[PDB]
């Protein structure tokens, strides 16, 4: 429940979101590719 505990949780979820966004990006590429090969 401290500020440092806040800094840590923020940094944790920032990293997570970023990795999710990258996965969505590289998977948007793949779906689009496949969809224009269909």
């Amino acid at each position: 429940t401290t500020w440092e505990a806040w800094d840590r949780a923020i940094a944790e979820y920032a990293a997570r979101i970023e990795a999710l966004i990258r996965a969505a990006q590289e998977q948007q590429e793949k779906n689009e590719a496949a969809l224009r090969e269909l």
């Binding site: 806040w6 923020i10 979820y13 979101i17 996965a23 969505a24 998977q27 779906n31």
Partner: protein, 36 residues
Amino acid sequence: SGIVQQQNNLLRAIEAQQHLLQLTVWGIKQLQARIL
């Protein structure tokens, strides 16, 4: 699987974003208590 994985990527990102929002609200509340 590709689009339904992407539905899942998107939902998960939104869930992570919600947890980030809760944390920001927490920060504001902490400040508010110390300032107010």
